[PDB]
Amino acid sequence: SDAVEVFKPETGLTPTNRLSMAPTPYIKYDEHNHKRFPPGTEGRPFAYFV
Amino acid sequence: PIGVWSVFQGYVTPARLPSIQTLTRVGAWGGVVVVGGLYMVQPWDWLA
Amino acid sequence: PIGVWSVFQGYVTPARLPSIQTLTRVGAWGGVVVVGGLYMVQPWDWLA
Amino acid sequence: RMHNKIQLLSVLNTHLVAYPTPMNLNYSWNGGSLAGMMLASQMLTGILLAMHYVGHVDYAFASVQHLMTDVPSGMILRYAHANGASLFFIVVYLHVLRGMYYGSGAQPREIVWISGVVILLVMIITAFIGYVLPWGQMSFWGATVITSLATAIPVVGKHIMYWLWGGFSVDNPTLNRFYSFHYTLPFILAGLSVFHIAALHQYGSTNPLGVNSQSSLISFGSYFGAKDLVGALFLALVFSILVFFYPDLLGHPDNLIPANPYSTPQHIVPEWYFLWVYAILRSIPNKAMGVLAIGLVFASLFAMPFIGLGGGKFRIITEWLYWTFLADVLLLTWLGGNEITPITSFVGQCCTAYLFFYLLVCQPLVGYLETQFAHG
Amino acid sequence: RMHNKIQLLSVLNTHLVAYPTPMNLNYSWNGGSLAGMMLASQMLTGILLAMHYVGHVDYAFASVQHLMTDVPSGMILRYAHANGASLFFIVVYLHVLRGMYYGSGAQPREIVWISGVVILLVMIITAFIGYVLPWGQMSFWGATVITSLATAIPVVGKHIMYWLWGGFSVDNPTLNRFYSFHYTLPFILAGLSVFHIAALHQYGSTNPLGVNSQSSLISFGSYFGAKDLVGALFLALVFSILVFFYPDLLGHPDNLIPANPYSTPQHIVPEWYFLWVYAILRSIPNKAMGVLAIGLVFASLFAMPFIGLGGGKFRIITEWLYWTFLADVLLLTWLGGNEITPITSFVGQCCTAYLFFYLLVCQPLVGYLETQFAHG
Amino acid sequence: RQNIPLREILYQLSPYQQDVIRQTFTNAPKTFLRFFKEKGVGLATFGVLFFGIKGYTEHEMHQERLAERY
Amino acid sequence: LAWASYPYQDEMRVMGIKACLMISILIGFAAYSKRLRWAPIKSQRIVMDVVN
Amino acid sequence: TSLLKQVALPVFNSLATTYRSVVGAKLAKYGLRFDDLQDPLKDEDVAEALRRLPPDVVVARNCRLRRALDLSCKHEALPKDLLEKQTPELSYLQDVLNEVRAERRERAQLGAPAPYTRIYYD
Amino acid sequence: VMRLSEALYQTFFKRSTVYIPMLLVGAYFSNEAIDYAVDKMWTTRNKGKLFSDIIAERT
């Protein structure tokens, strides 16, 4: 189904509409409390050992 | 809020207050409490 | 009609019964309670 | 509505005023409210009693006597608390027999039956350890005979027994801990009763006809308040007769003797409501097998919603078999107050065998035959 | 899906596992779980202590000593109970001060505040009658001084005093009835706590921002279980320090003397958590006026959700006056532990007057001015 | 369960793709200073009132004890 | 006499040292498990059209 | 009396402007407004005023509250470029709420109640 | 950065019925180590004051 008839968005180049039509792969999280690992880091987490 | 906010917002009017007949009939329950206490304690020389 | 009524009606087949692997995974909890009881009581070198 | 604005009034209205109940319930559906009234009465009388009781040896008997003769209204409170246990057990037993007759534990009311069986076990433990508290001969010797039955479990026997006693025999630590356990357990009884009533309200009650009654439901708070009040007044009449005219009829005279650990009475029997389990235990000539049979009775009680087929009338074979079961249980109650004799041992063994036969063979198999006869 | 099949799983899942909670709650929202844990700790250690305590004036102190020295782990249990009472009062007082700071009693949470004030009154009575049970000098003389406040009521004062005592003085019937009431009132506290918590779950908690939080809610069980565990461990550290290193720090040395009705101590003082009420009572040179002032304090606490305007951080004048109120109640706590003196009488009178001024004048009027400043 | 009209994009990372307590050492002095900056006025007025009234009361009590001497 | 008032002071202090050590380690472990669970929320990214 | 208030009113206005300056400095770091500080659960007139609003205003109010609650969880403030754009005193609710309260005051003088109640859950 | 090993994961972590007995033996040894450290520190600090020091002195 079409998103205009189902989600019924507002029209315009708003910040939410830009990510809705084309999401970016360069997602920035907040890093004030936790610094992320490098993306694609594999392996079973060390937190189980802790 | 409902207690003093209603007085301060002007929502407590004479037309919204209970009537004097309502206050008379509600306040008649005071004699019921007195006679209930006198029935429970029976602290009288009233029987003679 | 949960219990003996299920087996009288023919609802307990060879299928819908637990597998051997399921019973072994449930049956592996037998060692956990034994180790937990031995951890709680600690009767060291009590095996005869 | 005024009850729609305070959440306490909404719950009370929903579960005590406007609760839809079948309109054809007879007077055998008043067992539960009577049991709740007896629980509340026992709690009130005991909380009043505990203000004059001292839970120590060499003070317990004298404190009960001071309660009986010197505390204003103390004799009424003690006799009410003693006979209220008997009336509580009478009402709860008739409630259980009602549920046995009508098949009340079946789907979807299995949780109601299971929580009832748990309540019954807690009631038994509460009544036993409360019977120890006056510290007479029957109290001491019954507590001795029952607690020294953990020497049937192999290896871990007397360890558990001495940990229960707080020593090497029933003494002051046993009485002192029995007071605390007995004070505490009725609040667990009240909480389990609230959970038990809340489990029934999910699906509502059965009816004497044994059919679906969703089409004919009426309000609880108007129609079944006075109907419960009538039965409560009958129970109050029996209670007043027992307290004021025959206060020591249901007891044992040996419990008016102070406890002596070096002299035993001729006949050691419990209160009447424990007598059927005592007869089951005393009939089997092995301690471990007797404890196993006692545990098996309650296991078969727990398994009843999942093995029991067959209800009240229109299921007539199981209906007739219910009366043999009732006679068997009453016979076991009579046998527990007698002495050990070869004929009484044989009769008690036959009664225990028939009790297990009815609970485990008649209820599934005869019920299945009735279903195959009626709807097959 | 599995919790959809049993009622008890569904209620527990809804109110403990998947209950929505504001995501910005800080560590000031841990006082309720800590208070519940301290109530459970008090109930467990009290049930365990009741198996060795004897409620008689000839054996109470001696059984306390025997439990201290001879019972295995009895010293840990006795110190845990006596200091867990103080930690219970610390956690509850901080919980109430959180509610006073944020104005959490306001609409639609008037029932939560009112049930809280009821809980606090029951807690005060429970601790006061529990302190009499060791039957030391402070235990006897504080019960004598406080229950003698009933004679401030005219005509029927001495009759109520003698009815509560069971005699002409504080003696053995007082101790026995206090033991029964003390065993009983914690279960009423548990019921009141269940009702109090179920009242809050109707609307949810408030947040530190003081705004509506329905747009940002997360599950309680996954997130706030660990956050409550952290605070429980910080409380367990303080509990361990108080039990093992400083066990008589928050006590009084005179309660280790046996009770003597013919020689009073020089400085009769309560436990620290009743010292502000005691300072309010001692500051006024009239017994009836002091009792009335205490009753008016608790009436002002009941009337907070209907006269109180003004909340958290963004309402800055009442936020500044909160710290003056906190300094006033701690000054009342300090003044209760000091002897009667003209300057302490004057300072206590001024501190009581400021407490009444803050409760009845600042909270309505200054709250209304700041609502008119912010939104007029 | 209380429908809320809202327009947003939300992103969340796995808790095994970031660190747990390493930033806690960096932010600890800043959080200490921020806490005292936010609650400085209330703690100060509490301390001033409590310790000033207590000190005045204890001083006048000591003067009262000295006045009873011979 | 000081021993007579507190006969188990040495045993109480040894138990208190063990308890304080254990609870102090458990505080760090519980803080670790609290911060691990709350990490997807503390580092989430919200983008909306509101500027104000 | 009359001009009593006449003069007592500029002092009220000065205190109100100082109060709004301080609180709006506190509010702007969270991205909030003065009208966002009003809870439909706390007041039934605010609940009535909020359903008289167009949907985009309600969507914006919910977005601002969500951003502020996220900031409060993260122990953060807005960045400087967002913080300089914040308008804490731009009203969206005061006209509608004033009309609602005037209607309720008008109904009360004739003995009539408000045609709405509190928000009741469960 | 630091990451738990896969082969050590497949042995002691994938099933709870293997994880729990390992947890209990680790708990036993942790309690033993804490007991040893506390007792050694207490006996070293209070040397010459205990009752056992007087008894061993009288031998």
Ligand code: HEM
């Ligand atoms: C203190 C003990 C008890 C209390 C207060 C209690 C209370 C109640 C009440 C108030 C009812 C609804 C009215 C009625 O049918 O009587 C009820 C129903 C029921 N109770 Fe009890 N009960 C107790 C013990 C037991 C026990 C010991 C059992 C079974 C072993 C049990 C099993 C049931 C069942 C199956 C029902 C449903 C009956 C039906 O709807 O057909 N209860 N109970």
Ligand code: HEM
């Ligand atoms: C909070 C609830 C209760 C309290 C505080 C309480 C208290 C007491 C006390 C203090 C005694 C010893 C004094 C005496 O025997 O006269 C006692 C005895 C006894 N209790 Fe209760 N009780 C409670 C509930 C119950 C319940 C629910 C039952 C039965 C299911 C029960 C059964 C008994 C019995 C049979 C005795 C022996 C009475 C005698 O033969 O003298 N109690 N209880």
Ligand code: HEM
């Ligand atoms: C079912 C719950 C409880 C039971 C059975 C119980 C029982 C007892 C007993 C038997 C004592 C006397 C033993 C002693 O003095 O060490 C005692 C003391 C005491 N209890 Fe509890 N208690 C309970 C709950 C509570 C609660 C909720 C509080 C709340 C503040 C509390 C406060 C106290 C206090 C202050 C003392 C005096 C301790 C002292 O100074 O020695 N108790 N309790």
Ligand code: HEM
């Ligand atoms: C045994 C005592 C108590 C227990 C177990 C208890 C429990 C709780 C719990 C678990 C909460 C939810 C989270 C929290 O705010 O910590 C809560 C909230 C609350 N409690 Fe208590 N409480 C107790 C006493 C009190 C008292 C004495 C008062 C006030 C006089 C009170 C007033 C409140 C209020 C107003 C809230 C809602 C605050 C909010 O959500 O912002 N409670 N209580």
